[PDB]
Every structure is written in structure tokens, then in C-alpha cells.
């Protein structure tokens, strides 16, 4: 059961959520809207920026812990930007699913977080056969 | 059975994938590593940028049955950046899962794609009760 | 039965062929001869440049059955340069056959046409065991 | 039985092969890719350059050879570049076959290597009657 | 079963490996290939530089099982350079084997590590009787 | 049965061997011992340099049994530097074994001698699982 998060700043262009128990953990969503003339029709793209920030204390005393000393914190950030026409929402969602799958293959099941690249990784496209 | 990809340009710092049947579809993986050490500790930081690009045609008119009418492509881009120390990889993966859930709540099941933010969205944190 | 070609502009230094039915298709041969002599020897080398030009219509959309829609042509060019002494004609022909085989195994049976190189290709030399 | 040739430099943009017994014999393939807007659709042009180099010694002592003296070397080079859209690979391969046939009928079965042009040679196009 | 490594930096002239568990230890190989002008001969040299580093901790003091390791780890490196013509690769391999045996005699089974150069050691060459 | 050498230069810091049959072949070992100041520790490093040289003749031309050898010999050199604290000599020996295995994988059994760095070679570390 994940702890619910409630907003602190609400705006039509940006909303920020923070954990009531630890306000250092934040999650922000910002949308930017423009009109782009792609096919001589004014398509309305949306550039959504999603940022998740967690400040994580990692003194990392390997094996031993006796009392609480001041934790020095590091910043863990995950930023996601999705850009596309609103008229192609279903296709953008399919692209998002494919992006999740590819990033999972590289990072969650691979060693990309440790600074490695696998050219033999099974990266797959959004289109189907 | 989604269409597989093969690498086109290969560097240990940056590898970009492509679909042989459609070269406009690309997936980029770039890792930047720096030794950003906190006080009296050593930490290896791995910043990971993942970019997925698809060029999708504009939507055809709803009441159209013509055989072949091609209209110009629009740019669909999804970009994720993950920054964190190598020592905290498992917990960074947990943060990534929570980020997945939050973006899914806002975008996949919401109207963030069309450009509407809902302050009442059920956003949750990585920590459990 | 391939369509025959006739010469359109004629010079002993350069002769250009062209298809009477499609003047956009051309094939030329240009020979440049110089007396580049190596030490205590006399050698006459002939550098030959051959270009094939075909202007092809762009590929029609796959799900199309329209009678006549014409899209602008793209330039397809294949240029081959052969440089060598006249005394070594047999060895130059052997090198040309080996070049055929290597370019074929890279291009026709490979993916270099789309833009992928295979470090595991079976490239061979003209010499025999 | 032609001798296998193994690579010495491997890169996504250039791979060079060299004969283990004679490293002076090389075969290099270089790919250069751009996006060209021919038909208001961004075709992916691929320009592959293939170079075969053989340093052949031609002191050419006509009739007699008694002992091994230093061989002065001349360079034999064959350079081929193929340019075309990736979406027309089949027709590009047909163009390659026609180019091979025409260069053969000029060079292998003709006298082009010695510095001659034959205006009555049977040059053919890729199109079929 | 030793822990394998993956390449963190890949280049046509230098590849660097690193252990996923410990990023401190690396193994990098660099090759420099040049043409060497020798009398009445054209032979090309290949120089290889292989380095191995491990950042092992300084040795723990005697009789104290401290709660957490705080030892200020040191630098421990081995560097090897192999230079020779590719024409004589079999000889270079034999020389490498002989060099390994001699270094093992002086160091692996000797006390060169503590600083003693034994002048009665049995050093043997690549040539056999 | 390899031919042993005898020392031509004996010094407390450097010993040089040389084959009685061929004086060109020499093996040298030089040790540099210093005290290294590491936090709350006093441990002394010993750096050892090992050099092997062979003045092999360049390879004979093909098909000629010349009366006397006149070939202008070349230089083959192998240089190894091992640096580490004498307190950790056993682990230094383990690192030496791992380094030997890695160099054998790349060079002895691979094509690193001709100048090719294989990015998929099986490199293993000193640590065991």
C-alpha cells in the first residue's frame, strides 16, 4: 500500500505533489500547449513534463549501524517529457507503452543504471507485425 | 509480436536503434557518468537519457474512405532522464516503478495528453505503509 | 530482355549512353590515361570512372490502388572507379571480380543498403589458397 | 578457395578488412546517411562507399626471374559508391546488377582497361521490355 | 568463476571494461598501428597497451574487528606493452609466453614484490635447443 | 629446453640478462621501492619494470633461398610494469594471474596482434563468485 500524496501548489499549468510525511519527495506535472501547422491543419500538440524527485540519504555504512548520525542526502531525479498532437492520443499512449518496455529492458532488467550499454539488448518498436 | 530493432550507430556513450522497415523510428540511449561525491563518501553518478522518436502521419478525416491520401508526418517524442548513484540502483528502480504509476495515472487514464490537469489524481509515493 | 541503350554524346575521353524511351537513364565511361612510371620501369595506368544514373519515382503508399498519382523522382547513382596499370590487366580483372563478390555480400545479401554494417560479413581476398 | 579476410577497424560508420598474410590488401566500407525531402516525405538516403586496394608489385621482368629483388609496388584501387533511398532497395539492387553487367561488357570483355572506348558496345538499362 | 566485465568505453582504438559490482577495477586495451620503414621491406607494427587496476583497501589493523570498513584504499596497477610486426605474430606470441614465464620466475615464485632482485634466477629465452 | 641467459649487468636496482649465443636478446628487471603515505597508514610500494627484447630478422621474401641472410632485422619488445604494496603481495600475484589470462584472451587467442580490438571478448576479474 503506497502512501497517498497530496498537492501543495495547484495551477492550470503545473501541479506539485509532496509526501506529507516527507515534503522532500516531490512530483510535478507541467503542460505546454502550442499550435503547429504540420498538414496545413493547426494540430494542437502538448508537451507534458513530469518530474519525480526523491532525496535519498546514502552514507551507506556497509554492514554496521549503531545510532542516528546526520544523513547527507543525494538527489534522485526522473524526468519524462511526452510531446505529440492531441489528435493522436491513442498512438501517443502506444508509444508511451513501447517506451516503458524499452527503458525497462535497458535499465530495470539490464545494467544501464551502473553505466553500461548492451548492444545485444532486445529493443523493439511500437508497430506490430 | 512487435517489430524488432537493430542498432545503426554504436558508441559506448550513446547507442541509437532503428527499425529496418521504417528508418524514421529511433530509440536513443545515452549514459553520462561522473564522480559526484558527497561529504566523506564516494558515489558514482550515472545519468541516463532515453529518447524515443516516431514520425506518425496526421489523422485522416473521419468520414473518408479514399484508397491512398498521404498527409505529412508529425513528430512524436518521448524523453526520459534518470539520475542517481550506482549504489542505490534497486531503490532507483523502485522510484522508476512509482514514476511509471504516476505518469500512467495522469496520462494513460487521464487527460494530460489533451492538456487537462486534474488536481484530484491519485498520486502515490514509493514508500509503503 | 533489358532495353538497349544508344550513345548520345560521343568523345574518346568520355562516352555517355542513354535510353531513347527514358532520357533520364544514363551510363557513361570516362578513361584518363597517364604515364605514371615507378622506379626503373615504365607503366601506363588507366583510371576509369563509370556512373549509372536512374531517376526513380518515390514509393507509392502500400495500401493504395489509385490509377494515376505521380510523385517526384529521386536520384539513384552508382559510381565505380577502377585505377591500375595496363600491364596488370588480368590481376585487375581478378580484383574486380573480388570487389563484385565483396560488395554483393555486403549490399545484396546484407543490410548496408538500409544502413547497417555487419562486422561478421564473409569478406574474401583475390588470392587463393 | 579465396582466403578469409578479417577486420582490423570496426565502427558503425566504417569497417576496414585486411588480409592477415598481406595487411597491404584492404577493403573498406563507409556509410553516410542523410534525410532528403524529395516528395515532401523525408526519404532516408544511404551513400555507401566501398574501396578495395591491392598493392601489386610489377617490375615485370619479361621472361626471366632468378632471385628475389626488392619489389617496387603500384597501387590498384577500385572504388564504388551507391546512393539511393532505403525505401527503393529492390530497384537499387537491380541498378547494381545492371551496373555490374555494363561495366563487365566494357571492361572485362572489352578493352577499357587499356584505355579504349567501344561505341558499339551493348549497353543495357535496368528496365525490361 | 571470475566475475566478467562489460565495456564502458568502446572505440576503434581503445576499449575499457569495468566490473558491475565494483566500478573501481578496470581493464583497458589500446592499439596503435603504424607503418615501419625498413630496408627493402614494408612491414607494419602494432603496439598494444594493456593496463589492469584494482583499488584494494589498505590492510586492516591486527586484532580489531571494527564495525565498518573505513580503510583508505590504495592503487594497484599492472601495465603491459606489446610491440612487434604483425608479420611475425607467431614469434611475438612465443616471446609473450617466454616473458610470462620469466616474470613468473622472478615475481610469482620469487620475491621481486618485496624488492629483491635474485641474480641466480633461471631465466630462459624463446629460442629452443 | 630453452636457452638460459647469464647476467651482463648486475646492480642492486637493475639486473640485465643476455643470451650467450645471441647478445641482442636481453631481459631486464628494475625495481623502484618507495614509501607511500596513505591516511593513518605507512605502507611501502614496490614498482617493478620487466623488459624483453628480441632482434628478429624481418620475414624472408617468398620463393627465394638466398645464399646468405642479409635481411635487415627488426625490433620486438614486451614491457611489463607491476606496482603495488608489498603488504598485499598475494593479491598482487592474483591480479598478475588475472592480467595474464586477460592478455591471453585478447592477444594470444585473439586477433589483437593484427590490430583488431574485439568488443565481445570474455574478460574476467580477480574476484571470484
Listed in sequence order, the residues at least 6 apart from D26 whose beta carbon sits closer than 8 Å to its beta carbon are D16, D17, D18, D19, D51, D52, D53
User: Distances from the Cα of F102 to the Cαs of C78, E5, E28, E72, in angstroms?
Assistant: 45, 11, 10, 28
Listed in sequence order, the residues at least 6 apart from E120 whose beta carbon sits closer than 8 Å to its beta carbon are none
Q: Exposed/middle/buried for F31, CB within 10 Å: 0-12, 13-18, 19+?
A: buried
Listed in sequence order, the residues at least 6 apart from A109 whose beta carbon sits closer than 8 Å to its beta carbon are none
Q: Are C50 and D99 in contact (CB under 8 A)?
A: yes
The x, y and z cell numbers of residue E42, run together, are 614494408
Length of chain B: 129
Distance from C-alpha of E119 to C-alpha of E103, rounded to nearest angstrom = 14
Distance from C-alpha of D81 to C-alpha of A112, rounded to nearest angstrom = 38
Q: What is the sign, positive or negative, of the torsion defined by CA atoms of E117, E118, E120, E123?
A: negative
Distance from C-alpha of B109 to C-alpha of E16, rounded to nearest angstrom = 45
E81, E86, E107 member nearest F96 (Cβ):
E107
Q: Is B32 helix (H, G, I), strand (E, B) or coil?
A: strand
Q: Exposed/middle/buried for B23, CB within 10 Å: 0-12, 13-18, 19+?
A: buried
Distance from C-alpha of A93 to C-alpha of A50, rounded to nearest angstrom = 15
Distance from C-alpha of D107 to C-alpha of C30, rounded to nearest angstrom = 12
Distance from C-alpha of C81 to C-alpha of C48, rounded to nearest angstrom = 5
User: Distances from the Cα of A88 to the Cαs of B65, C126, E57, in angstroms?
Assistant: 19, 55, 57
Distance from C-alpha of F43 to C-alpha of E59, rounded to nearest angstrom = 9
Q: How far is CA D13 from the centre of its chain?
A: 18
User: Distances from the Cα of B93 to the Cαs of A1, B98, B103, C11, C36, in angstroms?
Assistant: 17, 9, 15, 71, 67
Question: Which residue in D has a C-alpha nearest to residue F116's C-alpha?
Answer: D8
Distance from C-alpha of D125 to C-alpha of C26, rounded to nearest angstrom = 8
User: Distances from the Cα of C35 to the Cαs of C44, C87, D115, E5, E75, in angstroms?
Assistant: 5, 12, 12, 56, 62
Q: Are A64 and B114 in contact (CB under 8 A)?
A: no
C-beta atoms surrounding A72 within 10 Å? 12
DSSP-derived secondary structure letter, B11: -
Residue for grid cell 573480388: C98
Q: Dmax over Cα atoms in chain F, in whole Å? A: 69
Distance from C-alpha of C46 to C-alpha of F49, rounded to nearest angstrom = 55
The x, y and z cell numbers of residue D41, run together, are 516525405
Neighbours of chain F (3+ CB pairs under 8 A): D, E
Question: Which residue in B has a C-alpha nearest to residue D88's C-alpha?
Answer: B21
E9 in reach of chain B (CB within 8 A): yes
Strands D124-128 and E2-4: unpaired
Distance from C-alpha of A76 to C-alpha of B47, rounded to nearest angstrom = 10
Distance from C-alpha of C80 to C-alpha of A78, rounded to nearest angstrom = 51
User: Distances from the Cα of F40 to the Cαs of B107, E58, E64, F87, in angstroms?
Assistant: 56, 10, 15, 15
For residue E122, the surrounding DSSP H or E stretch is: none
Q: Is E62 helix (H, G, I), strand (E, B) or coil?
A: coil
Distance from C-alpha of E112 to C-alpha of F81, rounded to nearest angstrom = 12
Listed in sequence order, the residues at least 6 apart from D21 whose beta carbon sits closer than 8 Å to its beta carbon are C127, D3
Q: Are B67 and A15 in contact (CB under 8 A)?
A: no
Distance from C-alpha of A17 to C-alpha of A27, rounded to nearest angstrom = 5
What is the least distance, in Å, from the CA of D7 to any CA of chain F? 7
Helix (DSSP H) and strand (DSSP E) numbers for chain D: 1, 6
Listed in sequence order, the residues at least 6 apart from E98 whose beta carbon sits closer than 8 Å to its beta carbon are E124, E125, E126, F2, F52
E105 in reach of chain F (CB within 8 A): no
Q: Are C92 and D113 in contact (CB under 8 A)?
A: yes
Q: Is E108 helix (H, G, I), strand (E, B) or coil?
A: helix
Strand order in the sheet with D42-57: C6-10, C14-18, C26-34, C45-57, C73-83, D73-85, D42-57, D26-37, D14-18, D2-10, C123-128
Distance from C-alpha of E40 to C-alpha of D94, rounded to nearest angstrom = 47
Asked whether the beta carbons of residue E11 and residue B12 sit closer than 8 angstroms, the reply is yes
Distance from C-alpha of D100 to C-alpha of C80, rounded to nearest angstrom = 10
DSSP for B50-115, please give it.
Answer: EEEEEEEEPPPPTT---S-----EEEEEEEEEEEEEGGGHHHHHHHHHHHHHHHIIIIISSSTTTT
Strands B73-85 and B45-57: antiparallel
Q: Are F123 and E27 in contact (CB under 8 A)?
A: yes
B8, B9, B24 member nearest D42 (Cβ):
B24
User: Distances from the Cα of C19 to the Cαs of C31, C89, D96, in angstroms?
Assistant: 22, 30, 17
Residues C90, C93, C99: CA angle, nearest 5 degrees: 145
Query: Phi and psi of F105, rounded to 5°?
Result: -65, -45
CA atoms within 13 A on the CB side of A18: 11
DSSP-derived secondary structure letter, E91: H
DSSP-derived secondary structure letter, F63: T
Distance from C-alpha of E66 to C-alpha of E109, rounded to nearest angstrom = 34
DSSP-derived secondary structure letter, A95: H
Listed in sequence order, the residues at least 6 apart from D84 whose beta carbon sits closer than 8 Å to its beta carbon are C74, C75, C76, C77, C113, D45, D46, D91, D92, D95
Helices (H), chain E: 89-103
Technique that determined the structure: cryo-EM
Q: Report the interhelical angle of C89-107 vs D89-103 (nearest 10°).
A: 170
For residue A51, the surrounding DSSP H or E stretch is: strand A42-57
Listed in sequence order, the residues at least 6 apart from F48 whose beta carbon sits closer than 8 Å to its beta carbon are E107, E112, E113, F29, F30, F31, F32, F81, F82, F83
Task: Please name which of B56, B54, B102, B111 lies closest in space to residue B78, comparing C-alpha atoms.
Answer: B54
Residue for grid cell 614496490: F46
Distance from C-alpha of A80 to C-alpha of A70, rounded to nearest angstrom = 32
User: Distances from the Cα of F23 to the Cαs of B14, F2, F116, in angstroms?
Assistant: 51, 15, 33
Q: Is C54 helix (H, G, I), strand (E, B) or coil?
A: strand
The x, y and z cell numbers of residue D106, run together, are 566494357
Task: Please name which of E92, E56, E91 lies closest in space to residue E75, comparing C-alpha atoms.
Answer: E56
Distance from C-alpha of F94 to C-alpha of F100, rounded to nearest angstrom = 10
Residue for grid cell 547497417: C116
Distance from C-alpha of C59 to C-alpha of A8, rounded to nearest angstrom = 54
Q: Is E21 helix (H, G, I), strand (E, B) or coil?
A: coil
DSSP-derived secondary structure letter, B119: T
Asked whether the beta carbons of residue D41 and residue B10 sit closer than 8 angstroms, the reply is no
User: Distances from the Cα of B71 to the Cαs of C51, D8, D88, in angstroms?
Assistant: 35, 46, 20
The x, y and z cell numbers of residue D57, run together, are 608489385
Restricting to A residues 58-97, those with a Cβ less than 8 Å away from any Cβ of B are 58-60, 72-89, 91-93, 95-96
DSSP for C96-120, please give it.
Answer: HHHHHHHHHHHHTSSSTTTT---TT
Helices (H), chain A: 89-103
Distance from C-alpha of E87 to C-alpha of E84, rounded to nearest angstrom = 9
The x, y and z cell numbers of residue C13, run together, are 575521353
Distance from C-alpha of A34 to C-alpha of A31, rounded to nearest angstrom = 10
Q: How far is CA D51 from the centre of its chain?
A: 6
Distance from C-alpha of C16 to C-alpha of D117, rounded to nearest angstrom = 11
The x, y and z cell numbers of residue C67, run together, are 490509377
Q: Compute and round to an integer the Cα radius of gyration of chain A.
A: 20
User: Distances from the Cα of E59 to the Cαs of B122, E78, E100, F94, in angstroms?
Assistant: 53, 19, 28, 16
Distance from C-alpha of D34 to C-alpha of D44, rounded to nearest angstrom = 6
B20, B23, B68 member nearest C66 (Cβ):
B68
Mutate to test the interface with A, among B17, B29, B61, B93 (most CBs of A within 10 A): B29
Q: Compute and round to an integer the Cα radius of gyration of chain C.
A: 20
Amino acid at each position: 500500500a503506497n502512501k497517498p500524496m497530496q498537492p501543495i501548489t495547484s495551477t492550470a499549468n503545473k501541479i506539485v505533489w509532496s509526501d506529507p510525511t516527507r515534503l522532500s519527495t516531490t512530483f510535478s506535472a507541467s503542460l505546454l500547449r502550442q499550435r503547429v501547422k504540420v498538414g496545413i491543419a493547426e494540430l494542437n500538440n502538448v508537451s507534458g513534463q513530469y518530474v519525480s524527485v526523491y532525496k535519498r540519504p546514502a552514507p551507506k555504512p556497509e554492514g554496521c549501524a549503531d545510532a542516528c548520525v546526520i544523513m547527507p542526502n543525494e538527489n534522485q531525479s526522473i524526468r519524462t517529457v511526452i510531446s505529440g498532437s492531441a489528435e493522436n492520443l491513442a498512438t501517443l499512449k502506444a508509444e508511451w507503452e513501447t517506451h516503458k518496455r524499452n527503458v525497462d529492458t535497458l535499465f530495470a532488467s539490464g545494467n544501464a543504471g551502473l553505466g553500461f550499454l548492451d548492444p545485444t539488448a532486445a529493443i523493439v518498436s511500437s508497430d506490430t507485425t
